[PDB]
GROMACS .gro file of N, CA and C in nm:
model
  372
    1UNK      N    1   2.573   6.103  23.121
    1UNK     CA    2   2.640   6.141  22.998
    1UNK      C    3   2.641   6.023  22.901
    2UNK      N    4   2.586   6.043  22.782
    2UNK     CA    5   2.571   5.937  22.684
    2UNK      C    6   2.663   5.963  22.566
    3UNK      N    7   2.720   5.855  22.513
    3UNK     CA    8   2.813   5.864  22.402
    3UNK      C    9   2.777   5.760  22.297
    4UNK      N   10   2.823   5.784  22.176
    4UNK     CA   11   2.807   5.686  22.070
    4UNK      C   12   2.900   5.568  22.095
    5UNK      N   13   2.863   5.448  22.047
    5UNK     CA   14   2.950   5.331  22.069
    5UNK      C   15   3.094   5.351  22.027
    6UNK      N   16   3.118   5.421  21.915
    6UNK     CA   17   3.254   5.449  21.870
    6UNK      C   18   3.337   5.514  21.981
    7UNK      N   19   3.285   5.621  22.040
    7UNK     CA   20   3.359   5.692  22.145
    7UNK      C   21   3.374   5.606  22.270
    8UNK      N   22   3.265   5.542  22.313
    8UNK     CA   23   3.268   5.455  22.430
    8UNK      C   24   3.374   5.346  22.414
    9UNK      N   25   3.382   5.286  22.295
    9UNK     CA   26   3.474   5.174  22.276
    9UNK      C   27   3.618   5.222  22.265
   10UNK      N   28   3.640   5.336  22.198
   10UNK     CA   29   3.773   5.396  22.193
   10UNK      C   30   3.826   5.423  22.333
   11UNK      N   31   3.739   5.472  22.422
   11UNK     CA   32   3.781   5.503  22.558
   11UNK      C   33   3.814   5.376  22.635
   12UNK      N   34   3.735   5.271  22.616
   12UNK     CA   35   3.756   5.147  22.688
   12UNK      C   36   3.892   5.086  22.656
   13UNK      N   37   3.936   5.097  22.531
   13UNK     CA   38   4.058   5.032  22.485
   13UNK      C   39   4.171   5.130  22.457
   14UNK      N   40   4.168   5.247  22.522
   14UNK     CA   41   4.265   5.352  22.492
   14UNK      C   42   4.407   5.313  22.531
   15UNK      N   43   4.423   5.233  22.637
   15UNK     CA   44   4.554   5.185  22.679
   15UNK      C   45   4.569   5.034  22.656
   16UNK      N   46   4.514   4.983  22.547
   16UNK     CA   47   4.520   4.841  22.518
   16UNK      C   48   4.592   4.822  22.385
   17UNK      N   49   4.699   4.742  22.386
   17UNK     CA   50   4.776   4.722  22.264
   17UNK      C   51   4.698   4.645  22.159
   18UNK      N   52   4.584   4.588  22.196
   18UNK     CA   53   4.498   4.516  22.103
   18UNK      C   54   4.386   4.603  22.047
   19UNK      N   55   4.394   4.736  22.066
   19UNK     CA   56   4.277   4.820  22.043
   19UNK      C   57   4.231   4.819  21.898
   20UNK      N   58   4.323   4.798  21.803
   20UNK     CA   59   4.281   4.797  21.663
   20UNK      C   60   4.185   4.682  21.633
   21UNK      N   61   4.194   4.573  21.708
   21UNK     CA   62   4.098   4.464  21.694
   21UNK      C   63   3.976   4.483  21.782
   22UNK      N   64   3.996   4.528  21.906
   22UNK     CA   65   3.889   4.526  22.005
   22UNK      C   66   3.794   4.645  21.996
   23UNK      N   67   3.838   4.757  21.939
   23UNK     CA   68   3.745   4.868  21.915
   23UNK      C   69   3.633   4.830  21.818
   24UNK      N   70   3.661   4.777  21.698
   24UNK     CA   71   3.549   4.735  21.610
   24UNK      C   72   3.461   4.628  21.672
   25UNK      N   73   3.521   4.533  21.744
   25UNK     CA   74   3.444   4.426  21.807
   25UNK      C   75   3.352   4.482  21.914
   26UNK      N   76   3.404   4.571  21.998
   26UNK     CA   77   3.322   4.640  22.097
   26UNK      C   78   3.204   4.712  22.031
   27UNK      N   79   3.229   4.778  21.918
   27UNK     CA   80   3.124   4.854  21.850
   27UNK      C   81   3.015   4.762  21.796
   28UNK      N   82   3.055   4.654  21.727
   28UNK     CA   83   2.957   4.560  21.674
   28UNK      C   84   2.872   4.498  21.784
   29UNK      N   85   2.929   4.477  21.902
   29UNK     CA   86   2.849   4.427  22.013
   29UNK      C   87   2.748   4.531  22.058
   30UNK      N   88   2.786   4.659  22.055
   30UNK     CA   89   2.690   4.761  22.096
   30UNK      C   90   2.583   4.780  21.989
   31UNK      N   91   2.618   4.759  21.863
   31UNK     CA   92   2.523   4.769  21.753
   31UNK      C   93   2.427   4.651  21.749
   32UNK      N   94   2.458   4.544  21.821
   32UNK     CA   95   2.378   4.423  21.814
   32UNK      C   96   2.407   4.336  21.695
   33UNK      N   97   2.520   4.357  21.626
   33UNK     CA   98   2.557   4.273  21.513
   33UNK      C   99   2.628   4.146  21.557
   34UNK      N  100   2.688   4.147  21.675
   34UNK     CA  101   2.752   4.032  21.737
   34UNK      C  102   2.706   4.028  21.881
   35UNK      N  103   2.670   3.909  21.929
   35UNK     CA  104   2.620   3.896  22.065
   35UNK      C  105   2.734   3.918  22.165
   36UNK      N  106   2.696   3.947  22.290
   36UNK     CA  107   2.796   3.972  22.394
   36UNK      C  108   2.879   3.848  22.425
   37UNK      N  109   2.830   3.730  22.389
   37UNK     CA  110   2.903   3.605  22.404
   37UNK      C  111   2.975   3.562  22.277
   38UNK      N  112   2.985   3.652  22.179
   38UNK     CA  113   3.051   3.637  22.048
   38UNK      C  114   2.972   3.552  21.949
   39UNK      N  115   2.853   3.505  21.983
   39UNK     CA  116   2.774   3.429  21.887
   39UNK      C  117   2.707   3.524  21.788
   40UNK      N  118   2.678   3.471  21.669
   40UNK     CA  119   2.606   3.543  21.565
   40UNK      C  120   2.495   3.451  21.518
   41UNK      N  121   2.371   3.487  21.548
   41UNK     CA  122   2.256   3.404  21.511
   41UNK      C  123   2.146   3.495  21.457
   42UNK      N  124   2.026   3.438  21.441
   42UNK     CA  125   1.911   3.508  21.384
   42UNK      C  126   1.888   3.649  21.438
   43UNK      N  127   1.889   3.675  21.569
   43UNK     CA  128   1.863   3.813  21.615
   43UNK      C  129   1.968   3.912  21.568
   44UNK      N  130   2.095   3.875  21.573
   44UNK     CA  131   2.202   3.964  21.529
   44UNK      C  132   2.197   3.985  21.378
   45UNK      N  133   2.161   3.880  21.303
   45UNK     CA  134   2.154   3.891  21.158
   45UNK      C  135   2.034   3.974  21.117
   46UNK      N  136   1.925   3.966  21.194
   46UNK     CA  137   1.807   4.043  21.159
   46UNK      C  138   1.837   4.190  21.179
   47UNK      N  139   1.911   4.222  21.286
   47UNK     CA  140   1.950   4.359  21.316
   47UNK      C  141   2.046   4.414  21.211
   48UNK      N  142   2.152   4.338  21.180
   48UNK     CA  143   2.256   4.386  21.088
   48UNK      C  144   2.200   4.407  20.948
   49UNK      N  145   2.124   4.309  20.897
   49UNK     CA  146   2.064   4.322  20.765
   49UNK      C  147   1.966   4.439  20.759
   50UNK      N  148   1.892   4.461  20.868
   50UNK     CA  149   1.798   4.574  20.873
   50UNK      C  150   1.872   4.707  20.861
   51UNK      N  151   1.987   4.721  20.928
   51UNK     CA  152   2.064   4.845  20.918
   51UNK      C  153   2.116   4.865  20.776
   52UNK      N  154   2.169   4.759  20.716
   52UNK     CA  155   2.226   4.770  20.582
   52UNK      C  156   2.120   4.808  20.480
   53UNK      N  157   1.999   4.753  20.494
   53UNK     CA  158   1.890   4.786  20.402
   53UNK      C  159   1.843   4.929  20.423
   54UNK      N  160   1.827   4.971  20.549
   54UNK     CA  161   1.780   5.106  20.579
   54UNK      C  162   1.872   5.212  20.520
   55UNK      N  163   2.003   5.188  20.525
   55UNK     CA  164   2.100   5.282  20.470
   55UNK      C  165   2.130   5.255  20.323
   56UNK      N  166   2.051   5.169  20.258
   56UNK     CA  167   2.059   5.141  20.114
   56UNK      C  168   2.196   5.091  20.071
   57UNK      N  169   2.265   5.018  20.159
   57UNK     CA  170   2.392   4.957  20.119
   57UNK      C  171   2.369   4.856  20.008
   58UNK      N  172   2.260   4.780  20.016
   58UNK     CA  173   2.208   4.700  19.905
   58UNK      C  174   2.057   4.721  19.900
   59UNK      N  175   2.001   4.693  19.783
   59UNK     CA  176   1.859   4.716  19.761
   59UNK      C  177   1.775   4.632  19.856
   60UNK      N  178   1.660   4.688  19.895
   60UNK     CA  179   1.569   4.621  19.987
   60UNK      C  180   1.524   4.484  19.937
   61UNK      N  181   1.524   4.462  19.805
   61UNK     CA  182   1.479   4.334  19.751
   61UNK      C  183   1.577   4.222  19.779
   62UNK      N  184   1.698   4.255  19.824
   62UNK     CA  185   1.802   4.157  19.848
   62UNK      C  186   1.812   4.114  19.994
   63UNK      N  187   1.709   4.140  20.075
   63UNK     CA  188   1.721   4.120  20.219
   63UNK      C  189   1.734   3.971  20.254
   64UNK      N  190   1.666   3.884  20.178
   64UNK     CA  191   1.679   3.741  20.201
   64UNK      C  192   1.820   3.692  20.165
   65UNK      N  193   1.875   3.740  20.053
   65UNK     CA  194   2.010   3.703  20.012
   65UNK      C  195   2.114   3.746  20.115
   66UNK      N  196   2.103   3.869  20.166
   66UNK     CA  197   2.202   3.920  20.260
   66UNK      C  198   2.195   3.844  20.392
   67UNK      N  199   2.074   3.807  20.436
   67UNK     CA  200   2.062   3.725  20.556
   67UNK      C  201   2.122   3.587  20.535
   68UNK      N  202   2.105   3.531  20.415
   68UNK     CA  203   2.164   3.401  20.385
   68UNK      C  204   2.317   3.407  20.389
   69UNK      N  205   2.377   3.511  20.329
   69UNK     CA  206   2.523   3.519  20.334
   69UNK      C  207   2.573   3.549  20.475
   70UNK      N  208   2.496   3.625  20.553
   70UNK     CA  209   2.532   3.648  20.693
   70UNK      C  210   2.531   3.519  20.773
   71UNK      N  211   2.430   3.434  20.751
   71UNK     CA  212   2.427   3.303  20.815
   71UNK      C  213   2.544   3.216  20.769
   72UNK      N  214   2.575   3.217  20.639
   72UNK     CA  215   2.693   3.147  20.589
   72UNK      C  216   2.819   3.195  20.663
   73UNK      N  217   2.835   3.327  20.675
   73UNK     CA  218   2.955   3.383  20.736
   73UNK      C  219   2.963   3.351  20.885
   74UNK      N  220   2.850   3.357  20.956
   74UNK     CA  221   2.850   3.320  21.097
   74UNK      C  222   2.903   3.178  21.117
   75UNK      N  223   2.864   3.085  21.030
   75UNK     CA  224   2.916   2.949  21.037
   75UNK      C  225   3.066   2.947  21.007
   76UNK      N  226   3.107   3.015  20.899
   76UNK     CA  227   3.248   3.010  20.859
   76UNK      C  228   3.336   3.077  20.963
   77UNK      N  229   3.285   3.182  21.027
   77UNK     CA  230   3.361   3.253  21.130
   77UNK      C  231   3.380   3.165  21.252
   78UNK      N  232   3.276   3.090  21.290
   78UNK     CA  233   3.285   2.996  21.401
   78UNK      C  234   3.390   2.890  21.372
   79UNK      N  235   3.395   2.841  21.248
   79UNK     CA  236   3.487   2.733  21.214
   79UNK      C  237   3.629   2.787  21.202
   80UNK      N  238   3.643   2.913  21.159
   80UNK     CA  239   3.776   2.972  21.147
   80UNK      C  240   3.840   2.989  21.284
   81UNK      N  241   3.761   3.027  21.384
   81UNK     CA  242   3.809   3.063  21.516
   81UNK      C  243   3.820   2.944  21.611
   82UNK      N  244   3.779   2.825  21.568
   82UNK     CA  245   3.770   2.712  21.660
   82UNK      C  246   3.908   2.675  21.713
   83UNK      N  247   4.010   2.676  21.627
   83UNK     CA  248   4.147   2.645  21.664
   83UNK      C  249   4.223   2.768  21.713
   84UNK      N  250   4.154   2.879  21.738
   84UNK     CA  251   4.222   2.999  21.782
   84UNK      C  252   4.273   2.983  21.925
   85UNK      N  253   4.390   3.043  21.950
   85UNK     CA  254   4.451   3.038  22.082
   85UNK      C  255   4.362   3.109  22.183
   86UNK      N  256   4.380   3.072  22.309
   86UNK     CA  257   4.301   3.129  22.418
   86UNK      C  258   4.306   3.282  22.420
   87UNK      N  259   4.422   3.340  22.390
   87UNK     CA  260   4.447   3.483  22.407
   87UNK      C  261   4.420   3.565  22.283
   88UNK      N  262   4.371   3.504  22.176
   88UNK     CA  263   4.335   3.576  22.055
   88UNK      C  264   4.194   3.631  22.072
   89UNK      N  265   4.184   3.760  22.100
   89UNK     CA  266   4.057   3.822  22.134
   89UNK      C  267   4.005   3.908  22.020
   90UNK      N  268   3.874   3.931  22.022
   90UNK     CA  269   3.805   4.027  21.936
   90UNK      C  270   3.803   3.988  21.788
   91UNK      N  271   3.841   3.865  21.753
   91UNK     CA  272   3.848   3.822  21.614
   91UNK      C  273   3.712   3.797  21.549
   92UNK      N  274   3.608   3.770  21.628
   92UNK     CA  275   3.477   3.741  21.571
   92UNK      C  276   3.434   3.851  21.474
   93UNK      N  277   3.442   3.977  21.519
   93UNK     CA  278   3.398   4.088  21.435
   93UNK      C  279   3.488   4.104  21.312
   94UNK      N  280   3.620   4.092  21.331
   94UNK     CA  281   3.714   4.101  21.220
   94UNK      C  282   3.679   4.000  21.111
   95UNK      N  283   3.665   3.872  21.150
   95UNK     CA  284   3.642   3.767  21.051
   95UNK      C  285   3.503   3.779  20.990
   96UNK      N  286   3.403   3.819  21.070
   96UNK     CA  287   3.267   3.836  21.020
   96UNK      C  288   3.262   3.950  20.919
   97UNK      N  289   3.329   4.061  20.951
   97UNK     CA  290   3.334   4.177  20.862
   97UNK      C  291   3.397   4.140  20.728
   98UNK      N  292   3.513   4.074  20.732
   98UNK     CA  293   3.580   4.032  20.609
   98UNK      C  294   3.493   3.938  20.527
   99UNK      N  295   3.425   3.843  20.594
   99UNK     CA  296   3.342   3.747  20.522
   99UNK      C  297   3.225   3.815  20.452
  100UNK      N  298   3.153   3.902  20.524
  100UNK     CA  299   3.042   3.975  20.463
  100UNK      C  300   3.087   4.052  20.340
  101UNK      N  301   3.206   4.111  20.344
  101UNK     CA  302   3.258   4.191  20.234
  101UNK      C  303   3.316   4.108  20.120
  102UNK      N  304   3.322   3.976  20.134
  102UNK     CA  305   3.350   3.891  20.019
  102UNK      C  306   3.227   3.870  19.932
  103UNK      N  307   3.110   3.917  19.974
  103UNK     CA  308   2.994   3.917  19.886
  103UNK      C  309   3.015   4.022  19.777
  104UNK      N  310   3.000   3.980  19.651
  104UNK     CA  311   3.037   4.066  19.538
  104UNK      C  312   2.954   4.194  19.533
  105UNK      N  313   2.841   4.198  19.604
  105UNK     CA  314   2.740   4.302  19.590
  105UNK      C  315   2.758   4.417  19.688
  106UNK      N  316   2.839   4.399  19.792
  106UNK     CA  317   2.850   4.495  19.901
  106UNK      C  318   2.977   4.577  19.882
  107UNK      N  319   2.960   4.708  19.865
  107UNK     CA  320   3.071   4.799  19.852
  107UNK      C  321   3.123   4.842  19.987
  108UNK      N  322   3.254   4.824  20.010
  108UNK     CA  323   3.311   4.856  20.141
  108UNK      C  324   3.293   5.001  20.184
  109UNK      N  325   3.297   5.095  20.089
  109UNK     CA  326   3.283   5.236  20.123
  109UNK      C  327   3.142   5.267  20.173
  110UNK      N  328   3.040   5.222  20.100
  110UNK     CA  329   2.901   5.242  20.140
  110UNK      C  330   2.873   5.173  20.273
  111UNK      N  331   2.925   5.051  20.287
  111UNK     CA  332   2.907   4.971  20.408
  111UNK      C  333   2.960   5.046  20.529
  112UNK      N  334   3.084   5.094  20.521
  112UNK     CA  335   3.144   5.170  20.630
  112UNK      C  336   3.065   5.296  20.661
  113UNK      N  337   3.023   5.370  20.558
  113UNK     CA  338   2.948   5.493  20.580
  113UNK      C  339   2.817   5.466  20.653
  114UNK      N  340   2.748   5.357  20.618
  114UNK     CA  341   2.622   5.324  20.682
  114UNK      C  342   2.641   5.299  20.831
  115UNK      N  343   2.744   5.223  20.867
  115UNK     CA  344   2.766   5.190  21.008
  115UNK      C  345   2.810   5.313  21.086
  116UNK      N  346   2.887   5.402  21.023
  116UNK     CA  347   2.926   5.525  21.090
  116UNK      C  348   2.805   5.614  21.118
  117UNK      N  349   2.709   5.616  21.025
  117UNK     CA  350   2.588   5.694  21.045
  117UNK      C  351   2.496   5.627  21.147
  118UNK      N  352   2.490   5.493  21.145
  118UNK     CA  353   2.411   5.422  21.246
  118UNK      C  354   2.468   5.447  21.385
  119UNK      N  355   2.602   5.451  21.395
  119UNK     CA  356   2.670   5.477  21.522
  119UNK      C  357   2.620   5.605  21.588
  120UNK      N  358   2.596   5.709  21.508
  120UNK     CA  359   2.552   5.837  21.562
  120UNK      C  360   2.411   5.832  21.621
  121UNK      N  361   2.330   5.733  21.586
  121UNK     CA  362   2.194   5.724  21.638
  121UNK      C  363   2.186   5.652  21.773
  122UNK      N  364   2.296   5.594  21.820
  122UNK     CA  365   2.298   5.515  21.942
  122UNK      C  366   2.367   5.597  22.050
  123UNK      N  367   2.297   5.619  22.162
  123UNK     CA  368   2.347   5.704  22.270
  123UNK      C  369   2.339   5.624  22.399
  124UNK      N  370   2.457   5.583  22.447
  124UNK     CA  371   2.467   5.485  22.558
  124UNK      C  372   2.576   5.524  22.660
   0.00000   0.00000   0.00000
């Protein structure tokens, strides 16, 4: 029985008081936008930018710019979380998501719709 990452992650964290943070983080890991070890590097950025372009969140001509801001955000997210307490979990995706959406060009509504549609194509 195969499910979309959204459903799989909701089930995993159904009895977890941290679920509002860990459900999105679980999903981004299944999408390949964040590595299973919480790192964000070239492979994850190539995947995430490819999804955003395919769903026309930004024009295809901006693919180099979006990869550059994703690399900027991966660095800033690492530096933000360095002093994080041991028990603060699932923040990588939260901080990465917020950072990407500080780019003036990316509309949060289109961005969310693209990832929701991408979610439906993954059966795991």
